[PDB]
Design a protein around this ligand. Sequence first.
Ligand SMILES: [Zn+2]
Ligand SMILES: [Zn+2]
Lengths: 97, 249, 370, 338
Amino acid sequence: GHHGRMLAIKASWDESGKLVPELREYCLPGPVLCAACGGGGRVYHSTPSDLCVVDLSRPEEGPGGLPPMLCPASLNICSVVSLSGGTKLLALSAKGR
Amino acid sequence: AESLELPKAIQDQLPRLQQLLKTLEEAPPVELQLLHECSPSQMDLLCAQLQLPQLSDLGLLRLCTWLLALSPDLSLSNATVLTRSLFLGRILSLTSSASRLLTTALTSFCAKYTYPVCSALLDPVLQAPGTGPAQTELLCCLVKMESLEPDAQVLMLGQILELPWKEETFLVLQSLLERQVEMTPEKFSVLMEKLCKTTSMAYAKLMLTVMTKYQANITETQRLGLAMALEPNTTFLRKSLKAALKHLG
Amino acid sequence: MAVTEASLLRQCPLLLPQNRSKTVYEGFISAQGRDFHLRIVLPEDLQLKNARLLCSWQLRTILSGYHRIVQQRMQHSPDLMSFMMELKMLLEVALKNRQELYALPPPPQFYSSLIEEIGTLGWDKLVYADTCFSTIKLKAEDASGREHLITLKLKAKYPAESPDYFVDFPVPFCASWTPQSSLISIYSQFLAAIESLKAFWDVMDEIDEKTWVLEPEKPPRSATARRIALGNNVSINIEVDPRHPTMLPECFFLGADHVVKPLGIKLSRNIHLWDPENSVLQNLKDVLEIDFPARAILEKSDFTMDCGICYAYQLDGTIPDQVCDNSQCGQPFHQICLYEWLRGLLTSRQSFNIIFGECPYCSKPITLKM
Amino acid sequence: DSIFVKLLKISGIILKTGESQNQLAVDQIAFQKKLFQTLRRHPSYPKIIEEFVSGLESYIEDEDSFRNCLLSCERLQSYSKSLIKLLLGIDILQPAIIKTLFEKLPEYFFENKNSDEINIPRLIVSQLKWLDRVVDGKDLTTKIMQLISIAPENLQHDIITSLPEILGDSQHADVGKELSDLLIENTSLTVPILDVLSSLRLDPNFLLKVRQLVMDKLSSIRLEDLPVIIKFILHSVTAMDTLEVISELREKLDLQHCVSSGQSCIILLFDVIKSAIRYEKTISEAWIKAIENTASVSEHKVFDLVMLFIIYSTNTQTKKYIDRVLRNKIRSGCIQEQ
Ligand SMILES: [Zn+2]
Ligand SMILES: [Zn+2]
């Protein structure tokens, strides 16, 4: 969602020994403008304040607690996974650059 | 008399069930999973029909262990119907303090299914006449178990408080309130109102213990109620009670 | 009440009959300081055999893999009353398992009062505060100039209840927590615990500098025992009393039984020449009439001081202690290894809880006392 | 500005604020006899003690003043007994002081471990230990028992434990009966009662009675307490009460019934039974003579086997006799797979 509802799904297979879908619904800060996925259970999303990141990687997660990258309002993000060294992403910052 | 049919699987496994109970006088089966197919109405015939009431000290105890393994939890009403065939006879029938087994068995069972257990049984044990030391000592142990979590001591409170107050209610209730069980002032006031309606040694100590732990919860108006409630000169330890009272003022 | 005219309202306040024939209830249900939507349509008669139960998509999330449980509950349940009792009991269960979604602090009490009490301490002290502000860690100094940390874990109401206080030093730490007590209270208590051990830390730091400490390796502040090495292939394990550290400790000897004998015998002669004015080392050197080597570690970096049965140091806490009474072997072993060796062989002969046998390497008489 | 503090100063003691141990201007004997004869010669001599104890009770309403009044006196010519202790040495004040001492103490249920981690309940009870005269036992009793009835666990547990130093010789047996009264009435406090009864001065007949009154409710007892229970049974056991208790013991005991903490204390029970039977041949001989006399029933139980293995493992003089009994039992078509 835009008003910062995030939906998380996973396979649980717990307590009955049968596959049950483990849902969260997170309510994250900020009107979310754009997001993308990076290597190792990481999502880069953006609010018109800040460009923030979310680690799902550890069933899954109680809260979805999140740092910025101190980058500005990037809308329309994109990711290329390098695996050379670290991950290298491409953005359009809100001002038009 | 009533013309009720047990589920056809229970009428079928009714003698396998009668086998298994007998077995438990000498990890659980599927036969115990068929109780989920009983309504409390059919279950009521079924408790009487398994003749759970005559199980040994040993026999009952092993059993209780099995019901507590069950994965879909037993419905409020169903869980209660059970209690009254399982224990309530023996509890009422108690003369000398309950077997370590029935304490254990009851307490362990009470540990999972405490609201159905205690929502059912507490009232009648106490709404029975000729309730003696033998009966109280296990409802003493009920409240005193670590397992009886705060939330459940609160639910115990909603129940202990809805009963007519006599000496038997107070002694158990002091020991629930002895933890510092959390109170909405809604219930604390009623406890205090109810407390404030009286000659008794039990009640003396009850009031005293409230006013040390829930000093914190004592309003001006509740301290007036306590001034009212301490009026008596039959009150033993009055100096203590009024010293504690005056110390709030 | 008995009737669900009144018992329904008294147990589910937030269930409002829309239709005249009390057939559509709607509105809410309460659940662990959390109200949720509900829209619960009955048939033209009061029957739950057929009933529509629709929800918030929020409610579908929390009734994850109980869809069938509650479908059972609808068909087997007598009344709507009883259904709601169960649906509450059931939500409480679902959420207490999913208990990792909860807990908002009281900001007018907490964040400020915590900033206030840390100001009371001083800002030079604080070393760590968690981004949930749940954990913090604080620093104090000894009179010696040693850093001693304290971890705190905080509740939603810090000043009301005790914060969980975790700290390394060996005697059990006691914090007189009142709702009136603060970070400064427990900090003074922490300094009190530091100074009762002030002589103790000095005796331990002295031993750790001047002697070949063996069997705590980077010891914490919690260690009261200190396995010192002396010469090679004999050791002394030393437990010290923290309140009387300079005073005589219980001490005893590991190694070859021909090497331990004169040392024990000279300790028994010279134990009255212990004096608590000197250090532990300055009393042991004149009691046992020896010096200690300074870290035969760096020269003897591979002397194979391993079991020589299993070829490992540290088998399940145990150390190479059992040795050969021989100048030419001197090979250490473990209790478990030497026992599973000497019991397995024919030749081995046991008195009561002792085995006499042959040393594996040199085939000389070796004794094991379990 | 009270007759209490005034007449204390007259009789030759310094009554301090309450922050360090109270000084004493005269000898303790001199103080006590002077305070006695000064209250004697005062007009309204029977009525001065009411005013005396009213002044005292109003004085000791602060914690710390009272606590310093309970603590060791400073001796100028160098420690001594407390001001309340030296008052208690005076017999005419004594019953009144008991009355007061017992009246207020439930204030200190929940204020245990104040300032220097000292229990004012233990202080106020330790004012009654080794008293060289007691005027009234029965008053003292009925109040101590009513206190015991209501009070939470460790407090009363401690009173129980301290009862042997407190009580005079006339009032042993009395207490005995009413403790057996408490025994049936509460289980939790089985242990210290027992310890007490065995550290009292009583008649052995009564002890037989209570021991049976153990034995009947022994299914109701949580396991933790059993060892010291059964230790008590096997020190109360005579040479002549051997098979009696043992047959009864051997019956009532279950060890199917008890079952992670259960297993550990079962083991520790067996340690304790080992030490019992290890440690008197009286039991071993008669124990066996009580298992051979159960060759009748095919139904003799897990305990009888495990117990045999035990007496063979521990007791040495009997090895032939165990083997003899086991062989004459096992041939008979008794002990088998099941
Ligand atoms: Zn080894
Ligand atoms: Zn060798």
